[PDB]
Scaffold this motif. Structure first.
Motif, PDB file in Angstrom:
ATOM      1  N   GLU A  32      33.305  46.888  32.192  1.00 50.37           N
ATOM      2  CA  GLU A  32      33.506  46.827  33.871  1.00 50.37           C
ATOM      3  C   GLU A  32      33.782  48.008  34.175  1.00 50.37           C
ATOM      4  N   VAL A  33      32.836  48.718  35.292  1.00 51.40           N
ATOM      5  CA  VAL A  33      32.943  50.196  35.264  1.00 51.40           C
ATOM      6  C   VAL A  33      33.844  50.470  36.680  1.00 51.40           C
ATOM      7  N   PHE A  34      33.539  49.830  37.549  1.00 51.86           N
ATOM      8  CA  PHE A  34      34.643  50.182  38.901  1.00 51.86           C
ATOM      9  C   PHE A  34      35.611  49.061  39.102  1.00 51.86           C
ATOM     10  N   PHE A  35      36.861  48.946  38.100  1.00 52.84           N
ATOM     11  CA  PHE A  35      37.825  48.050  38.318  1.00 52.84           C
ATOM     12  C   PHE A  35      37.649  46.746  38.320  1.00 52.84           C
ATOM     13  N   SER A  36      36.827  46.178  39.419  1.00 56.51           N
ATOM     14  CA  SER A  36      36.747  44.837  39.480  1.00 56.51           C
ATOM     15  C   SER A  36      35.652  44.152  39.249  1.00 56.51           C
ATOM     16  N   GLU A  37      35.340  42.925  38.921  1.00 55.19           N
ATOM     17  CA  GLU A  37      34.014  42.304  38.860  1.00 55.19           C
ATOM     18  C   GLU A  37      33.557  41.179  39.960  1.00 55.19           C
ATOM     19  N   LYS A  38      34.374  40.278  40.262  1.00 56.63           N
ATOM     20  CA  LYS A  38      33.895  39.364  41.140  1.00 56.63           C
ATOM     21  C   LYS A  38      34.869  39.550  42.637  1.00 56.63           C
ATOM     22  N   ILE A  39      35.614  40.522  42.506  1.00 57.91           N
ATOM     23  CA  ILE A  39      36.729  40.705  43.678  1.00 57.91           C
ATOM     24  C   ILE A  39      35.878  41.143  45.018  1.00 57.91           C
ATOM     25  N   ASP A  55      41.913  45.843  55.029  1.00 55.89           N
ATOM     26  CA  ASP A  55      42.772  44.950  55.391  1.00 55.89           C
ATOM     27  C   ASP A  55      42.306  43.507  54.449  1.00 55.89           C
ATOM     28  N   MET A  56      41.425  43.654  53.876  1.00 55.31           N
ATOM     29  CA  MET A  56      41.152  42.395  52.996  1.00 55.31           C
ATOM     30  C   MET A  56      40.093  42.563  52.090  1.00 55.31           C
ATOM     31  N   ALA A  57      39.916  41.388  51.069  1.00 53.83           N
ATOM     32  CA  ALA A  57      38.590  41.355  50.235  1.00 53.83           C
ATOM     33  C   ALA A  57      38.330  39.784  50.159  1.00 53.83           C
ATOM     34  N   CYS A  58      37.798  39.334  49.181  1.00 55.38           N
ATOM     35  CA  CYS A  58      37.038  38.123  49.072  1.00 55.38           C
ATOM     36  C   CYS A  58      37.179  37.751  47.604  1.00 55.38           C
ATOM     37  N   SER A  59      36.656  36.476  47.090  1.00 51.12           N
ATOM     38  CA  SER A  59      36.445  35.910  45.985  1.00 51.12           C
ATOM     39  C   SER A  59      35.121  34.941  46.068  1.00 51.12           C
ATOM     40  N   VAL A  60      34.101  35.177  45.268  1.00 50.25           N
ATOM     41  CA  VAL A  60      32.953  34.560  45.343  1.00 50.25           C
ATOM     42  C   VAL A  60      32.887  33.600  43.970  1.00 50.25           C
ATOM     43  N   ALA A  61      32.252  32.728  44.259  1.00 47.96           N
ATOM     44  CA  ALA A  61      31.839  31.556  43.083  1.00 47.96           C
ATOM     45  C   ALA A  61      30.473  31.016  43.540  1.00 47.96           C
ATOM     46  N   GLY A  62      29.504  31.409  42.489  1.00 49.69           N
ATOM     47  CA  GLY A  62      27.950  30.842  42.870  1.00 49.69           C
ATOM     48  C   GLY A  62      27.199  31.943  42.271  1.00 49.69           C
ATOM     49  N   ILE A  63      25.955  32.151  42.735  1.00 50.80           N
ATOM     50  CA  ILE A  63      25.004  32.892  42.354  1.00 50.80           C
ATOM     51  C   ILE A  63      25.423  34.494  42.737  1.00 50.80           C
ATOM     52  N   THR A  64      25.528  35.487  41.391  1.00 47.51           N
ATOM     53  CA  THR A  64      26.138  36.692  41.872  1.00 47.51           C
ATOM     54  C   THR A  64      25.207  37.403  42.994  1.00 47.51           C
ATOM     55  N   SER A  65      23.876  37.238  42.570  1.00 49.44           N
ATOM     56  CA  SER A  65      23.061  37.648  43.371  1.00 49.44           C
ATOM     57  C   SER A  65      23.319  37.517  44.972  1.00 49.44           C
TER      58      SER A  65
END
Lengths: 220, 232, 239, 238, 233, 247, 228, 233
Positions: F57-64, F70-80
């Motif tokens: 994992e290069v830059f700290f997160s994966e799916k974050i 002021d905010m972030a997200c979380s994704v579930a589905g096709i990464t593309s």
């Protein structure tokens, strides 16, 4: 601004001042008028610095696709027909005056690119505000098929001739040497004059300045 | 650009995409409203909450402008585009005319949008139906229903969504001139129509009454239950 | 479903829409031409559907330019389509270079336009086949064909119509390269009359044109004086 | 297998074979011809069959050997409609090099831009992949003879002894047999080597009228066609 | 399965053959052309009593002397009535005269059968107009009445019956109509046929009348004046 | 050519869209993600479907995929499809900064997106987005917010919910364990694992398969910090001690 | 151009089209990279069915930028599209920021280009799985870009035929303390598992990326590494 | 099955099935006819009667002073192609600034009809046309096929039962050279009578006859102006 170049036996030589003046007041004494196009070919610049800067990288990236896709070395005349093609599209709005030189499979080549798109092929060319005084030196001692040290002595003599004459050049002399194999680039080649040592001491003691408010923000 | 034939004629002259658009809103929530005298009452039904939802984002009833406030039923997505468009046009009439919109002028524009997407290429028809309430310069109550086919009609009372025909049967029977005179009975008529479909008890509905002076303020659930014990 | 598209090539690597369009010529009346020393002679056998038609209607002889004529076969609809298209490069080539367009040049331009429609399924490929010819100092007699697929070949002779391989049988033995323009007219119509069908087809009209030294490189229709010599010769050979 | 639109348009097959590209492989077989080329040291030669079934054909205007640029010729095998399409294209590609970039385009860069156009066909269902195969020869200031081929699949991969047409399969057996002797018969007589190929597999031995030969040499860098009398000079040698 | 433009073995244009079938499901409208003027009566077909009849008007004013009548799908009708209102003003844009009734339907019928699914327009009709229109007005040539075909065919009609009741009503119009009939005689004679084909009870509520005279501009009859004719029947 | 068109924008005889129906099946087989709204802040969780060891994992997160300051997200589905959605939100959220120069409210940001997500379900003849994702953030008025965006573009506020695989049984178990107003930043972290243990097949988690990011405000500014593997592993052991005492 | 998508969701809801895209990479030329401490080693299998082919032109490992290069497993022409795109996306960085582009940055731009052809119609997806390596911030970078456009960070991975069996040998022997010289040895041993033939200096093209930048090894220099 | 639903598909016989379906719409419709003499050319158009109350049709339009046309089949593309000639004939007074020769007008129309035939999503024009014009070369009669093919005829009839009309044209064709103003319409009327049913008859109401010639500009004649021309029946 004074830029000049010559064609010696095994290669060419480029030269430029370090002085970049805005109006009648000097701005940058560390400015580099000579820019990097390709590993085997470089280019000078004069007139508007910002115009020559961006134009240099526009053609530089174009030669990057060339050299990487072709797998061979780029040619002088190649980039020459790009500059006059781009400057002809602007009908003289861009005041960029460039001097292109390098060594390709064919041999040493030196060009003079005017803002309107006029390009010439010469063994020696001078551009910039001091192109006049710099040309007078080449009209004298220039000999065909000279040596490497003989060229660096002739060029630097021409640039310094303009530096001591033209008001828009000085503070240092920059040169570049491009042969068929080896490459030599010396930014600080010759410094004609240095700043004198300050006699008195203008340093002010701590607390002599009135400070109204003060804020300190720590960091990691 | 995408250019294709989506809505095309069929035998007998039916339009599949127009008829199939109605099938979407008939399966949605039940929205009922009544045109009164000095007050208009409108409310919608909520599927479920389960304490895990924010009641603000699930609101079907919206406000197009000060005078006109529109609610929708069925598919929620398409309604978001219309509301965003209509609120721009609420200012357009206020721009030129220097007077607020009527219930008809805001309905014609919403009806004109549904017409264009039941006809023009590459656009699917809206599967939404809305009930638009509002007052004129004279405070006269008006209710104009929008249809996905692109037409519109006026109603004293009517329902959209699931059981729209069953609620309409209950509205035709109990509608009297005494109900529109009393603000209570006007509100009570809408609640009784909404409680007919709901067999689960409690309050599944969000009730909002829009008057003249101090326009519209959404009634709190305690204020809604205040009228439930009286009709029980 | 390989046929339906313009695009597709069938498991044998064959384009059906061009072949389906190629059959439009085989269903069309015969139009032939002969390449001689001093020029190229054009001719067309025009099927007469009804007597109510004014004489000279449904003209299949098009004049492309001063030195270039046109004889179209197949569907007349697409034939007139490339007619004005042939007038484009005609007015273009001279607007730039300033020359009468050589037939080799024009044969390249119209071949790309015909092939441009065989690449896409959004347009139907042209099924018509037309003949072009020119005579000039440098080039001399030149006769080229444009296939419905956009293929250009040089030809000493041309056989096109309902009878194609059967029409070139008499064209096989000619020796017209030893003869001049005004003597080809008797040979042209002689081939046209013998290949006509008297069962299905009934009456036809003979329209002839040629370019040569007597015309000074101009494309014009054969006058009726020489035209009547056909029936005075070729018709007598029918017995 | 073919599932849905796999066979009709250009899309991934269940094996990802791109059936439309495979169907284009058999498009060259419609001509029924064969073309071979072999590069030498200081020279390069192209020997292909020119079929004249009709005596009314004009032998000067019907050929597969076209002049592309001064230093580069071409031979193409496939549908003539698809053939002539690449003619103007490769000319548009080379002239853009001489104007913008400003000098003579190599066979590598001239055949590389052709594959950039051909790859557009494989990814678009609107346009079909062309069934023509280009074979180019040219003299370079460094690598000398350059023989590169562009197929319908979009492969610019360069060859040494080239084969094309219906006999492209069996004709390699004659060419692959040459890996023993030096540089696949690299002489000034290489013109005779390519002529032997076509005559070996087809068992014909074409007359001087049925052979067309382009040649580029270090002495003559320009592409030139040999007359039927000059073809007989090599034919009488065997 | 088929394109926007397809002809059958007849070559009708399928989509119009299906568009005409949509008019047969619409409301009934019968105009009459007499020497005094033209009367238009359209059935509203009110479904439920809670519906407000004053909000539904299938007879709208186009020009001062020219009205409108529609039947079938109202959705497409709300467009052309806005288009025709421009076309009438487009004649005031140039000639400074009342637009002839002949040129009104003539210009509106031009937009008929303008559609396509391929490179036709960034937006435009994907289906033809499935609405039938009856236009009328009094010009220097007198009162006229026109009918519009979804295929764009316009024709002058003295008495035309359209809608679900169009079958069998046109045979009834031939008997009752004459050349000596006044405007009031055509009114009453029209409602008698409309009362027979209506499944409900005809009254001043669900019926809509309008008249155009050479001395009187486009005008409609309110529930009062509508009941006057009902009492006479 | 209508012959090769799949007709994605046509309505079903029941009034649905076949492409939107199958879009929910995509996220159904994707990774499981959940979120909890509390008074002290808002959190998330994710189940990483890649257990391979050599994956870095290069830059700290994966799916974050941090949306803004002021905010972030979380994704579930096709990464593309999830990658373009982050590229679009980061533009619009900064287009807020342009047109506004305030922190963007979570309600306004999801609006401008789900309105763009609907266009592909309406016109263009293109397949819709197959990503059903979540939002954690904070605004000036309503404070911390949690939203759920379906592939059709219909979003709503959620105090506690779940997406991805086994979200049905997840949300059903969140109804019992959630309490209105009594949720803090700490207790909400400990409850998230209880659902993650039943959804995932293995009994215990190695803290590598999961990632939890905290969002709160400190010193008048919101700070988004992903919990370190040590901070997660220490918090998992706290949940392991509660399971031994409950049995 | 057809505006409607050629790729749609299944009733299962996995996209069909890119699922068949993995079948194309499984049949292409295998490529195995390895991430080491001081750099990255890249070695791929270049197969030529006959000596008639010329190996001095085609390169399966081509330089993208000075510090970045690309190796692929999949279709040839589909890879040619990416080379021209990957080099032009870097010029969008170079003309702007006047610095070297991070590999994490260049791959994410390619990930967006992968998707545009999967969703938008009239164009098919790419059938090539890229592997991009670069040297920036004094750290090695080894990535893999699937046809769907989801970039996966790898250390030592395997593509081409038997890529599942390729990870076997990699998971067996792999050390993070290895250097550029030691990583070249294990890079050949992975491809040496099953070559279905006899590997030579012309049957493999090796390249490396490190502080010295990115370049390729001549067939003579590779012979020294072929002694084992 | 899949052939008939697309415009650009080529039939296995080598023709366009869409043109075959485009001509059937022209072959079925109202009947019209035209003729040409030495110094004049006269056309006769029948207006099909839908009902006794409504006006029959309008089969004739005025193009220019020296050019006029009768239409058949669909009215939509009729007026469409007419609007072309409306602008093209005005362009003749713009560019050329003279009367447009009829020989050039048939070429411009043919270029407009060929465009939709060669493209996808475009139907061919389903309107047959009959043009009557005059120039320095004398009067001409041109037939416009719904296909892009252009025809030139001495006489022809487009409509139902056109075979019996062409049969009458195969007899007196030789007599059409020398005629006066009365004998012109005399052949035209009885020519149209062949297409009429045995239970119908040719009257002044259902006939519309345009006439264009050397000193006679094109003018449409209604039921009133055709009274002196029907006395020869």
């Amino acid at each position: 601004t004074t830029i000049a170049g010559v064609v010696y036996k095994d290669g060419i030589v480029l030269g430029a001042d370090t002085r970049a003046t805005e109006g009648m007041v000097v701005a940058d004494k560390n400015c580099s008028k000579i820019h990097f196009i390709s590993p085997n070919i470089y280019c000078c610049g004069a007139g508007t610095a910002a115009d020559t800067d961006m134009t240099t990288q526009l053609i530089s990236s174009n030669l990057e696709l060339h050299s990487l896709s072709t797998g061979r070395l780029p040619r002088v005349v190649t980039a020459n027909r790009m500059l006059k093609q781009m400057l002809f599209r602007y009908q003289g709005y861009i005041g960029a005056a460039l001097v292109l030189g390098g060594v390709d499979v064919t041999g040493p080549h030196l060009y003079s690119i005017y803002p309107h798109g006029s390009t010439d092929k010469l063994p020696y060319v001078t551009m910039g505000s001091g192109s006049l005084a710099a040309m007078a030196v080449f009209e004298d001692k220039f000999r065909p098929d000279m040596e490497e040290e003989e060229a660096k002595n002739l060029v630097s003599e021409a640039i310094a001739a303009g530096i001591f004459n033209d008001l828009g050049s000085g503070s240092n002399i920059d040169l570049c040497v491009i042969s068929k194999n080896k490459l030599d680039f010396l930014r600080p080649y010759t410094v004609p004059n240095k700043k004198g040592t300050r006699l008195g001491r203008y340093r002010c003691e701590k607390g002599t300045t009135a400070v109204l408010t003060e804020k300190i923000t720590p960091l990691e | 650009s995408y250019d294709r034939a989506i809505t095309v004629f069929s035998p007998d002259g039916h339009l599949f995409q127009v008829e199939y658009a109605q099938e979407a809103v008939k399966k949605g929530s039940t929205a009922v409203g009544v045109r009164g005298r000095d007050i208009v009452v409108l409310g919608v039904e909520k599927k479920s909450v389960a304490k895990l939802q924010d009641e603000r984002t699930v609101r079907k009833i919206c406000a197009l402008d000060d005078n006109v406030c529109m609610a929708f039923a069925g598919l929620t997505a398409d309604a978001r585009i219309v509301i965003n468009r209509a609120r721009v046009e609420c200012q357009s009439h206020r721009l030129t005319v220097e007077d607020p919109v009527t219930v008809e002028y805001i309905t014609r524009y919403i009806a004109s949008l549904k017409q264009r997407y039941t006809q023009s290429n590459g656009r699917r028809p809206f599967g939404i139906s809305a009930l638009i309430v509002g007052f004129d310069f004279d405070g006269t109550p008006r209710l104009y229903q929008t249809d996905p086919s692109g037409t519109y009609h006026a109603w004293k009372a009517n329902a959209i969504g699931r059981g729209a025909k069953s609620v309409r049967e209950f509205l035709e029977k109990n509608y009297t001139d005494e109900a529109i005179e009393t603000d209570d009975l006007t509100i009570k008529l809408v609640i009784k129509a909404l409680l007919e479909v709901v067999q689960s008890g409690g309050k599944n509905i969000e009730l909002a009454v829009m008057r003249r002076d101090q326009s519209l303020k959404i009634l709190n659930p305690e204020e809604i239950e205040k009228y439930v014990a009286e009709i029980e | 479903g390989y046929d339906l598209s313009a695009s597709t090539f069938s498991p044998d690597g064959r384009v059906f829409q061009v072949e389906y369009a190629m059959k439009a010529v085989e269903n069309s009346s015969t139009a032939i031409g002969i390449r001689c020393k001093d020029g190229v002679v054009f001719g067309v056998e025009k099927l007469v559907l009804s007597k109510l038609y004014e004489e000279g209607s449904n003209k299949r002889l098009f004049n492309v330019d001063r030195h270039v004529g046109m004889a179209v076969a197949g569907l007349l609809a697409d034939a007139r389509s490339l007619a004005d298209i042939a007038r484009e490069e005609a007015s273009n080539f001279r607007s730039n270079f300033g020359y009468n367009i050589p037939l080799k040049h024009l044969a390249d331009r119209v071949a790309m336009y015909v092939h441009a429609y065989t690449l896409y399924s959004a347009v139907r490929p042209f099924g018509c086949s037309f003949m072009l010819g020119s005579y000039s100092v440098n080039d001399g007699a030149q006769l080229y064909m444009i296939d419905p697929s956009g293929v250009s070949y040089g030809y000493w002779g041309c056989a096109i119509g309902k009878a194609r391989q059967a029409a070139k049988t008499e064209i096989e033995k000619l020796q017209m390269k030893e003869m001049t323009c005004r003597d080809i007219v008797k040979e042209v119509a002689k081939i046209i009359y013998i290949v006509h069908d008297e069962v299905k087809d009934k009456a036809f009209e003979l329209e002839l044109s040629w370019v040569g030294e007597l015309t000074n490189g101009r494309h014009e229709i054969v006058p009726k004086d020489i035209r009547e010599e056909a029936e005075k010769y070729a018709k007598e050979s029918l017995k | 297998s073919s599932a849905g639109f796999d066979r009709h348009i250009t899309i991934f097959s269940p094996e990802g074979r791109l059936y439309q590209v495979e169907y284009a492989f058999k498009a060259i077989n419609q001509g029924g011809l064969t073309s071979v080329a072999v590069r030498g040291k200081d020279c390069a030669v192209i020997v292909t069959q020119k079929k004249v079934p009709d005596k009314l054909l004009d032998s000067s205007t019907v050929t597969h050997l076209f002049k592309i640029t001064e230093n580069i010729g071409c031979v193409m095998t496939g549908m003539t409609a698809d053939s002539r399409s690449q003619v103007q294209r490769a000319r548009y590609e080379a002239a853009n090099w001489k104007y913008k970039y400003g000098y003579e385009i190599p066979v590598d860069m001239l055949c590389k831009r052709i594959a950039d156009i051909s790859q557009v066909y494989t990814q678009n269902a609107e346009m079909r992949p062309l069934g023509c195969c280009m074979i180019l020869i040219g003299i370079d200031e460094e690598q000398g003879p350059q023989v590169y081929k562009c197929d319908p699949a979009g492969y610019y991969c360069g060859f040494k002894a080239t084969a094309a047409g219906v006999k492209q399969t069996e004709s390699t057996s004659f060419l692959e047999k040459k890996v023993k002797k030096k540089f696949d018969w690299t002489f000034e007589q290489t013109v005779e080597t390519a002529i032997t190929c076509l005559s070996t597999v087809l068992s014909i031995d074409f007359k001087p009228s049925e052979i067309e030969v382009g040649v580029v040499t270090v002495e003559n860098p320009k592409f030139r066609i040999l007359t039927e009398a000059e073809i007989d000079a090599h034919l009488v040698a065997l | 399965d088929r394109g926007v433009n397809t002809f059958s073995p007849e070559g009708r244009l399928f989509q119009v053959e299906y568009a005409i079938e949509a008019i047969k499901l619409g409301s009934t409208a019968i105009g009459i052309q007499t020497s005094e003027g033209v009367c238009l009566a359209v059935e509203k077909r009110i479904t439920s009593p809670l519906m407000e009849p004053s909000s539904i008007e299938k007879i709208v004013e186009i020009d001062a002397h020219i009205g409108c009548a529609m039947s079938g799908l109202i959705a497409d009708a709300k467009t052309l009535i806005d288009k025709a209102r421009v076309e009438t003003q487009n004649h005031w844009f140039t000639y400074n005269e009342t637009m002839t009734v002949e040129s009104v339907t003539q210009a509106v019928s031009n937009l008929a059968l303008q559609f396509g699914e391929e490179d036709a327009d960034p937006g435009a009709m994907s289906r033809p107009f499935g609405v039938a229109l009856l236009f009328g007005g009094v010009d220097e040539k007198g009162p006229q009445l026109f009918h519009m075909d979804p295929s764009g065919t316009f024709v002058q009609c003295d008495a035309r019956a359209i809608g679900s009741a169009s079958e069998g009503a046109q045979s009834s119009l031939q008997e009752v109509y004459h050349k000596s009939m006044t405007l009031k005689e055509a009114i009453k004679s029209s409602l008698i046929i409309l009362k027979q084909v209506m499944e409900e009870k005809l009254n001043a509520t669900n019926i809509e009348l309008a008249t155009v005279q050479p001395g009187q501009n486009f005008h409609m009859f309110t529930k009062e004046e509508l009941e006057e004719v009902i009492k006479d029947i | 050519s209508r012959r090769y068109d799949s007709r994605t924008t046509i309505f079903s005889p029941e009034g649905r869209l076949y492409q939107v129906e199958y879009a929910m099946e995509a996220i159904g087989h994707a990774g499981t993600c959940l979120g909890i709204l509390a008074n002290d802040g808002v959190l998330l969780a994710a189940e990483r479907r890649n257990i391979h060891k050599l994956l870095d994992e290069v830059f700290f997160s994966e799916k974050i995929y941090k949306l803004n300051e002021d905010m972030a997200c979380s994704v579930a589905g096709i990464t593309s499809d999830a990658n373009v959605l982050t590229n679009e939100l980061r533009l619009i959220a900064q287009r807020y900064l342009l047109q506004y120069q305030e922190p963007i409210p979570c309600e306004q940001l999801v609006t401008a997106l789900c309105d763009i997500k609907q266009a592909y379900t309406q016109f263009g003849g293109k397949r819709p987005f197959g990503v059903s994702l979540l939002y954690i953030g904070w605004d000036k008025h309503y404070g911390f917010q949690l939203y759920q965006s379906d592939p059709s573009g219909n979003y709503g506020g959620w105090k506690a919910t779940c997406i991805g695989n086994n979200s049905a049984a997840a949300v059903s178990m969140l109804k019992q364990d959630y309490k209105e107003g009594e949720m803090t930043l700490k207790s909400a972290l400990a409850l998230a694992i209880k659902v993650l243990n039943k959804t995932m097949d293995v009994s215990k988690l190695s803290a590598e398969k999961v990632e939890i990011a905290t969002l709160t405000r400190e010193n008048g500014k919101t700070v988004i910090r992903v919990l370190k593997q040590k901070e997660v592993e220490q918090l998992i052991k706290k949940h392991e001690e509660e399971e031994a005492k409950a049995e | 151009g057809y505006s409607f998508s050629l790729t749609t969701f299944s009733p299962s809801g996995k996209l069909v089209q890119i699922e068949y895209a993995l079948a194309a990479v499984a049949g292409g030329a295998p490529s195995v990279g390895i991430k080491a401490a001081n750099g990255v080693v890249l070695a791929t299998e270049k197969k030529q069915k006959s000596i008639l082919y010329d190996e001095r032109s085609v390169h399966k490992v081509e330089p993208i930028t000075k510090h970045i290069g690309l190796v692929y497993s999949g279709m040839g022409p589909d890879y040619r599209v990416l080379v021209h795109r990957a080099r032009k996306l870097a010029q969008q960085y170079y003309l702007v920021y006047q610095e070297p582009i991070p590999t994490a940055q260049l791959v994410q731009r390619v990930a967006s280009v992968m998707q545009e052809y999967t969703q938008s119609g009239g164009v098919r997806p790419f059938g090539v799985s890229l592997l991009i390596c670069g040297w920036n911030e004094g750290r090695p970078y080894l990535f893999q870009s699937d046809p769907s456009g989801a970039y996966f960070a790898w250390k030592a991975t395997a593509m081409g035929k038997n890529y599942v069996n390729g990870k076997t040998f990699l998971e067996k022997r792999y050390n993070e303390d290895l250097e550029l010289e030691d990583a070249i040895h294990t890079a050949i041993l992975t491809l040496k598992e099953s070559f279905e033939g006899q590997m030579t200096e012309d049957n493999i093209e090796v390249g490396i990326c490190n502080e010295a930048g990115f370049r390729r090894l001549t067939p003579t220099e590779v012979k020294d590494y072929l002694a084992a | 099955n899949q052939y008939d639903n697309d415009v650009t598909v080529w039939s296995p016989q080598g023709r366009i099935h869409q043109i075959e379906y485009a001509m059937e719409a022209v072959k079925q419709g109202s009947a019209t006819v035209g003729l040409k003499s030495k110094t004049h050319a006269v056309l006769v158009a029948l207006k099909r009667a839908q009902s006794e109350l409504a006006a029959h049709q309008k089969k004739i339009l005025h193009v220019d002073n020296h050019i006029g046309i009768s239409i058949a089949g669909l009215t939509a593309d009729a007026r469409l192609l007419c609007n072309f000639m409306r602008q093209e004939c005005l362009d003749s007074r713009f560019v050329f600034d003279r009367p447009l020769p009829v020989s050039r007008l048939v070429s411009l129309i043919g270029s407009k009809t060929q465009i939709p035939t060669q493209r996808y999503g475009r139907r061919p024009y389903g309107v047959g046309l009959l043009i009557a014009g005059y120039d320095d070369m004398g009067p001409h009669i041109f037939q416009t096929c719904p296909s892009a093919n252009y025809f030139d005829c001495r006489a022809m009839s487009i409509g139902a039962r056109s075979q019996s009309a062409r049969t009458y044209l195969e007899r007196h064709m030789s007599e059409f050279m020398e005629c006066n103003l009365n004998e012109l319409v005399k052949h035209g009327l009885r020519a149209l009578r062949e297409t009429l049913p045995a239970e119908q008859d040719l009257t002044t109401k259902n006939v519309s006859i345009g006439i264009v010639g050397k000193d006679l500009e094109f003018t449409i004649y209604d039921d009133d102006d055709v009274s002196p021309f029907l006395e020869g029946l």
